[PDB]
Paper text:
For phosphopeptides with this canonical motif (hereafter referred to as canonical phosphopeptides), the phosphate moiety could act as a “phosphate surface anchor”, mediating extensive contacts to HLA-A2.
Typical of canonical HLA-A2-restricted phosphopeptides that bear suboptimal anchors, the PKD2 phosphopeptide exhibits phosphate-dependent binding to HLA-A2, with its affinity higher in the phosphorylated state (Kd 38.5 nM vs 284.5 nM for modified and unmodified forms respectively). Comparisons of HLA-A2-PKD2p and HLA-A2-PKD2np (both in P212121) revealed a very similar overall MHC conformation, with an rmsd value of 0.21 Å. Upon phosphorylation the epitope adopts a raised conformation at position 4 enabling additional phosphate-mediated MHC and intra peptide contacts, typical of canonical phosphopeptides (left). Consequently, the molecular surface presented for T cell recognition by HLA-A2-PKD2p and HLA-A2-PKD2np is substantially different. The conformational change also provides an explanation for the effect of phosphorylation on PKD2 affinity for HLA-A2: although the differing main chain conformations alter pMHC contacts, the net energetic effect is likely minimal, other than the additional p-Ser-mediated MHC contacts, which most probably underlie the stronger HLA-A2-PKD2p interaction. For PKD2, the conformational change resulted in a net increase in pMHC contacts, explaining the overall phosphate-dependent increase in affinity. Unsurprisingly, each epitope structure adopted a restrained main chain conformation at the position 4 Cα in its modified form, typical of previously examined canonical phosphopeptides.
Numbering used by the authors:
A (entry chain C): 1 to 9
B (entry chain B): 1 to 99
C (entry chain A): 1 to 274
Write the structure that this text describes.
């Protein structure tokens, strides 16, 4: 199951 | 950074003339991921070729497996033909049943 | 046994027309179990092993939403990095991310990782403490300060020691019949004469799982390195792996040479001789 997190550099 | 592909051409099962099998072309160690890979029978392109989903190693370099059903024989030559940005001319690696 | 779960994400920009090509894959140990390809028809996270298929509609909905969001994150990243590196908008570039967790024999947490690359070089990586960042250059330093301010390492540390590990155990249970089974290498030696006074011996290991393996040659009970060749481990195409090692020997001295095979599926190492 994927990580519940969404981030850009 | 551009890294040239390593290439292995080989059969899924030990090869026996006239007995069906799977022809594999494994490309790895390359960057960027855009790449063209064909399987050849007597220098011609085989049409029903499939491949794995793109993935990569620890050092970030890519790998892919191209494959198709085939039947080894005494007369047919099999090969994998690879082009990539790092190569100035397509590289042809011949299938050798001993490797 | 001892185990891992890993996700891999690649986006490649397409200057000229449209959105990047995006490809995501998930693995338990050496077994692919899910995939997403932005070029496919479904536009869904898809199953790739029998044991994941029993997950219900809410799993597939959730994993689809998460992977499509990931794809959009990558797309924004490709724009940001082009700026940071003062690069033209005419060329194609790549972003890669890998993350996941290992557990020991007791299925308890051993380590976690989360790392990013731009154009095939290290960009930013979470350290082993799951608290700190390794930034390779001054662009990555900017990103490190941004992720400090957004509590990113905190969230990663919680996933990696928690959800990552809990769902890995679940998969290990549901896929017991294949995932907890070791397939020992089927081994044999071939002989290829090169002349009237020399020959190649090739030691084969076939149809094994997991991929980890060691093949070594000895001469008269001592390790031999001169005149050997060792190919990279390669997929058979049916979920198993292949490898071989070869040595050139004086014809008639074949006996002195032994091939030694180490693999998790073998109680004790194998020895082969011609």
């Amino acid at each position: 199951r994927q990580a519940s997190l969404s981030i850009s550099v | 950074i551009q890294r040239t592909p390593k290439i292995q051409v080989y059969s899924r099962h030990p090869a026996e003339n006239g007995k069906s099998n799977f022809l594999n072309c494994y490309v790895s160690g390359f960057h960027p991921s855009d790449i063209e890979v064909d399987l050849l029978k007597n220098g011609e392109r085989i049409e029903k070729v499939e491949h794995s989903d793109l993935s990569f190693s620890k050092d970030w370099s890519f790998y892919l497996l191209y494959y198709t059903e085939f039947t080894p024989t005494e007369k047919d030559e099999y090969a994998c033909r690879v082009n990539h940005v790092t190569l100035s001319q397509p590289k042809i690696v011949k299938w050798d049943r001993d490797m | 046994g001892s185990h891992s779960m890993r996700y891999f994400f690649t986006s490649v920009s397409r200057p000229g027309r449209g959105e990047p090509r995006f490809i995501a894959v998930g693995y338990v140990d050496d077994t692919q179990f899910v995939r997403f390809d932005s070029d496919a028809a479904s536009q869904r996270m898809e199953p790739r092993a029998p044991w994941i298929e029993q997950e219900g509609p809410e799993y597939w909905d959730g994993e689809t939403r998460k992977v499509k969001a990931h794809s959009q994150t990558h797309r924004v990243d490709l724009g940001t990095l082009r700026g940071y590196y003062n690069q033209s908008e005419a060329g194609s570039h790549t972003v890669q991310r890998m993350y996941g967790c290992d557990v020991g024999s007791d299925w308890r947490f051993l380590r976690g990782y989360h790392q990013y690359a731009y154009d095939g070089k290290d960009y930013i990586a979470l350290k082993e403490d799951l608290r700190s960042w390794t930034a390779a250059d001054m662009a990555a330093q900017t990103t490190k300060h941004k992720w400090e301010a957004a509590h990113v390492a905190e969230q990663l540390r919680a996933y990696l020691e928690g959800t990552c590990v809990e769902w890995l155990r679940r998969y290990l249970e549901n896929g017991k019949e294949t995932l907890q089974r070791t397939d020992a290498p089927k081994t044999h030696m071939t002989h290829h004469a090169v002349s009237d006074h020399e020959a190649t011996l090739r030691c084969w290991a076939l149809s094994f799982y997991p991929a980890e393996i060691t093949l070594t040659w000895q001469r008269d009970g001592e390790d031999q390195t001169q005149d050997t060749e060792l190919v990279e481990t390669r997929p058979a195409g049916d979920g198993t792996f292949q490898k071989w090692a070869a040595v050139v020997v004086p014809s008639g001295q074949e006996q002195r040479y032994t091939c030694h095979v180490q693999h998790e599926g073998l109680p004790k190492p194998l020895t082969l001789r011609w």
